[PDB]
Every structure is written in C-alpha cells, then in structure tokens.
Design a protein around this ligand. Structure first.
Ligand SMILES: [K+]
Ligand SMILES: [K+]
Ligand SMILES: [K+]
Ligand SMILES: [K+]
Ligand SMILES: [K+]
Ligand SMILES: [K+]
Ligand SMILES: [K+]
Lengths: 367, 367
C-alpha cells in the first residue's frame, strides 16, 4: 500500500503537457507574409487553432476520466503505477491521431488509429479497475459528482506554466545572436543585434505578466473553494483553453504592422482572448456562488469579509479588456496607448487592490 | 494568511521547465550529416550538451535558494505571490544570458547581463525576506540543513515528464504527413508515409519507457524517505541532469547507421547515459543508508522487509546498462539484440520484481 499523491501529480503534469502540444504549431506560424499572402496564412492559423481547441478538450476529457478512475481507486502500488504509465503513454497519442484524422478525412486509417488509441486507453483503465477490485485494499473506503480540487489545481498550474514559458523557450532556442550575423549584419555590435530582438522580449514580458496574474486570480479563487463541481470544471477547461492563445496575441500585438488598421485589429483580438480567459473564471466564481454553502468558504459568501475583494480580483481583467475593446471601437486613435497602459496598470491594481477596494467602498459610502 | 503549497508547486513547475530549456537544441541537432561533415557536428553537439548541463546546474542552484527562502518563510499572501512571480520571471532569463556569455566570451555585455539577472534574483529574494520579517505572522514558527522533500519531488516529477514527452511533442509538431508528400513521394498511401516515420515512434516508445521506469524507481525510493539532505539533493540533481540526454541517445540508437561500428558506439553511449542516470539514484539510496535512522523508514533499513526489493529496484538499470556495455566491448556481434531485449525485459523485470527477488533469495537459501 502506497500513497497515490505523487503518481497523480506526475499524471497531471504529463496530461497538461499533452493538452498544450498543439499550441506550438500556432505560435510557430508566420507572423505576416509581407507580400500579401494574407489569404492562405490566416486560413492555416484558424485550422491550427481549431485543432488545438479540439485536442485540448479531448485530452481534458481523458484527464477527467482518469480523475474519476483514481477517485474510485484510493491507494496505489507498483502494478497500478506501471499500468498508469501505460495509460499515460496511450493518452500521449491522442493529439497525433486526431491531427491525422482531421488532416486525411477521406482515408479510414486515421479514424481507425484514433479509435484504437481511445479503446487502448479504455482497456488500460478497465485493467486498473479489475486489479483494484480483485484487491479490495486498493479501493477507497466508501467503495469498500464533484471533481477533485487537487487534480484541477495541478492540471491548471501546469497549463499556466507552459503558456507563460512558451515564448522564452522559443527565444532561448532561436533568438540567440550568432557571431557571424552580429559582426556582419550589425556592424560589429552585440547590443544592436540584441535590440533587434526586443519585440519578442516585450511579448514574453507581457505574456508572462498576464498569465501569471490570471494564475494569481485562479489561485486566490481556489484557495476558498470547498467542492469543485463538473460545471466549474467545464468553465475552468474553457478558461485554460483560451489562456493558451495569449502568447500568439502578444506576438501579434508587439510585432510592427503595415498600417494602423491591423494595429487596432490585433489589439481587439488580444483583448478578446483575455476577456474570454478571464470571464470564464468569473463564471466559475458565480456558479460557485450559486451554491456557496456546499462550494465556498464563508469568507467569500454574500456578506463575507473577502467577497468584494474576490469579485474585484476576478472582474479586473474582464473589465479592462472590455474597456480596451470599447477604446478600439469608439476612440480609435489612442487605443494602442490604452492597451499598453493597461498592460502596465493591471499589475499595479492587483498589487494595490485592497487599498483601491477600500477607497471605492468609501466613495459608495458617503455618497 | 494563505497556504503556500500551490504557489511553490507552480514555482517548481516553472523552474523545471526553465532547467530543461537547453536540451531542445540538443535533441533538435542534425542526426548525421551523411556527407562526412562529421567533425563540426559532434563539436556543436558537445558544446550544446555542456551549455545544457551548466544551465541545469545554475537553475538548480536558484531553485535550491528558493526552497530555503520559502522554508524560512512559512505562509504566503498576495504581495508575496506577486513578488514570487517576479522572482520566477527573473530566473527565466538565466539560460539566455548564460548562453550569450559563453557564446560571446570576449565582449563584456554578456557577463554584465548574467550578473544583472543574478543580482535581480537576489534583490527580489531580499525583498521577500524583508516583507516576511516586517510581518512576523508570515514566518515559520521555529523562526518566530535538510531540503524539503516536497520541492525535490515536484521538481523531479516535472523534469521527468518533460524528458519523457520531448520526442512525442516534436513528432506531433513536425512528423505529421502532409497530403502532397503522401500522394506524391509515397505513391498515394498514408500507411507508407507513416511507416517511414517509424524510427521516431520507436525512439519515443523507448525513451518514455526508460524515463517512466526511472521515475518509478525515484518514486519508490522517496516514498520511504524521511529527511532529504543536501548530498541527496546533489545526487538527484546529477541524476536528473543525465536523465535529459535519454531522448538523444534513443534518437541515435533507433536511427540507422552507416556501418556497424557506429551502431556499437551509439549503443555504448546510450548505455552510459542510462548507467549514470541510474547510478546516481543508487548513490542517493546508499547515502541515505549511511544515516538510515534519520533518513529512511524502518521498512528499508538494513534488515527491513523492503530493503532488498529497493536495492533491486534501484540497481536493476545500472546492472543492465553495465552488462550491455560489456556486451558491446567483448561479444561485439550480438550487442544490438542484447540492448533491444533489455529495453523489452527491464520493464517485465520491474513488473515481476517481487517474484524474481523471492526466487533469487531461495536460490541463495538452499545453496
Ligand atoms: K501537484
Ligand atoms: K506541471
Ligand atoms: K512542460
Ligand atoms: K513546451
Ligand atoms: K506538486
Ligand atoms: K511539473
Ligand atoms: K518542452
């Protein structure tokens, strides 16, 4: 008999890596053709984004089945650990097979391989169940629809870390000046070649800050969560899926455009992605409030000490993205500066959120 | 006041990603030139491997400083979480700056940037300390040289997951047949184009199995660990550093070579990498045995029920790699088959390890 905490943490890490595998083809796409190949580039980008979303959802369904399986199976052992490794190996093949099926939709080999992967996952899970039931001491006591907050938290943390580090990974792999280009194309100067790679650094900074503040909000929320439901899990899955597109949005924003219309368009798209990623966390919080007694600590109840602070922490990014979108639409001349100042300010708001909340409550007070 | 478990898990995930960032240039290197560019390819590969090892060690030192910092700082809060995000952002720049310093060793800007990153990490940590000491309730009770097993476990799990999924990530990103090459270069056949990518799939299978069994050994060992020491942490760091080179080894082995001498050489290199990665875990176990009372559960003491089983679980891979190396050296004609059969057998040995241990103990018994 062994504790299964670390095995499930390892599984969560693997599954988080496998769910974000199809976002690299998205962030590795052509920024812009620059010869007006505009039609076929956005097409491929949209197809890649659809494939990413579908693969994320499928791997999340697999992860949820795994969580239920090892909620009915309490303690693990050597054989169960090896079978779980086999299950992880099976799951690792879902993105490749799905991409193959949606790339070659006419030949039956792709759907065949997809269904084979699925059936193999199911067979490994059934073997785990059979082993656990042949040895009753490996079953949870109640055996001998709330999700496990542990697994949700670990999975979300992994997704957030990957999405926050994508751009720095790509930088460190590719954007390191080579001496030849330095003292040939830049007239013997390393500082020049490094400044040439400034846009990517600013994109990484923005993406890391945004993803880290969204993780901060998620962490503050789930510190007060008692029982995670399936609806909250769905909303968290949607939030995480839309969190993966922040690196692409920041890449497009920081990149210089041809004419300001594309500037406004890219700012709009980035604000939309942020708004979705954040409004789904806000929806998680409201769905939990629907049943606060069996879902939330009394601190964040209707009338609790930390209720308004949590509302603000979770509604900060959505309101900012909405205001930036309204800027893009109406003003339409100071939109980029508004977006950049919000990039810089939202963090300072998170840092001074308690002071601002008190000031605003006093404002409501004596008026 | 908030619990800091999830913040530190997130930090461990980020740091594990950042420590394995320089292994991608290694696994993305030319397999072989095929026109006898042999000299300058192995040179660049060795330089990349050295850079990877150095960056891994530096990020591990940063991670250890972080662990000590948040061992003296018990509970976290919003400000501490944001400052920790800043510290993570700082650490994320260590690999890039070190690669820049070792690439341009003559100009002083590289070492300048490296030292700037280091000083920024230190300043953020000093700010965290100052905040925690200005608010005593954020200090651990004993404040108001053993490492934390929690952080070691999380960091190791992240490294293991990344190293086990590298090759499948690269496959799903690049090795997905495109219809043109399928019905042009393969004479209208998807199965042919998929079989052409078989070597990479076999490499991924082998790497995943090996890394998962090494994680299995690590997990079994640290299930019985009470107090992790600094020596055990050093040995684990070395083991993890040498675990990152398994994907490259399997890539080279599964790839077809020009003449069998390179076959034997690649088998030797792979066996050596496995031997190091595993002998350092064995050394962890022996160093713990040095002080079993204050380091190990009584189950794995000298004379415990699960002592010999742990010895076998940890000495299985080293002995197998050593036997395969001796095969390469002496026999030298059946070495590849021996290596492949060991790839297939070591898992079955792990699965039936208890039966084999009992059989061998009886063998020792009545002889
Ligand atoms: K975890
Ligand atoms: K993770
Ligand atoms: K990762
Ligand atoms: K990645
Ligand atoms: K953890
Ligand atoms: K991890
Ligand atoms: K990676």
């Amino acid at each position: 008999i062994q504790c299964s905490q670390r095995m499930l943490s390892f599984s969560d890490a693997l599954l988080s890596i496998i769910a974000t595998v199809m976002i690299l083809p998205v962030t590795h796409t052509e920024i812009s053709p620059e010869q007006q190949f505009d039609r076929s580039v956005q097409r491929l980008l949209a197809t890649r984004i659809a494939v990413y979303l579908m693969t994320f959802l499928i791997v999340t369904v697999a992860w949820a089945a795994h969580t239920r399986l090892f909620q009915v199976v309490g303690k693990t052992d050597d054989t169960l650990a090896l079978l779980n490794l086999a299950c992880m190996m099976t799951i690792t093949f879902l993105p490749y097979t799905f991409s193959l099926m949606v790339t070659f939709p006419d030949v039956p080999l792709g759907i065949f391989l997809f269904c084979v992967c699925v059936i193999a996952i199911g067979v490994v899970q059934a073997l785990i169940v059979g082993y656990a039931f042949h040895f009753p001491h490996l079953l949870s006591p109640q055996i001998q629809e709330p999700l496990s907050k542990e697994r949700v938290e670990a999975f979300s943390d992994g997704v957030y870390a990957i999405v926050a580090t994508l751009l720095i990974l790509d930088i460190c792999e590719d954007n390191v000046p080579d001496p030849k280009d330095v003292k040939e194309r830049f007239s013997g100067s390393l500082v020049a070649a490094l400044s040439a790679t400034g846009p990517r650094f600013l994109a990484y900074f923005g993406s890391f800050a945004t993803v880290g503040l969204l993780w901060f909000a998620h962490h503050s929320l789930f510190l007060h969560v008692r029982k995670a439901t399936r609806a909250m899990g769905l909303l968290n899955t949607l939030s995480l899926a839309f969190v993966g597109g922040l690196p692409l949005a920041y890449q497009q924003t920081s990149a210089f455009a041809r004419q300001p219309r594309d500037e406004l368009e890219r700012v709009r798209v980035s604000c939309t992605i942020i708004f979705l990623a954040s409004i789904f966390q806000l929806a998680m919080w409201t769905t939990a409030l629907l049943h606060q007694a069996e879902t939330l600590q009394p601190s964040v109840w209707f009338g609790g000490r930390e209720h308004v602070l949590m509302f603000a922490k979770l509604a900060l990014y959505p309101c900012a993205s909405l205001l930036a979108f309204a800027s893009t639409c109406l003003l339409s001349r100071f939109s980029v500066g508004i977006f950049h100042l919000m990039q810089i300010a939202v963090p300072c708001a998170f840092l001074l959120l308690r002071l601002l909340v008190g000031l605003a409550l006093a404002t409501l007070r004596v008026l």
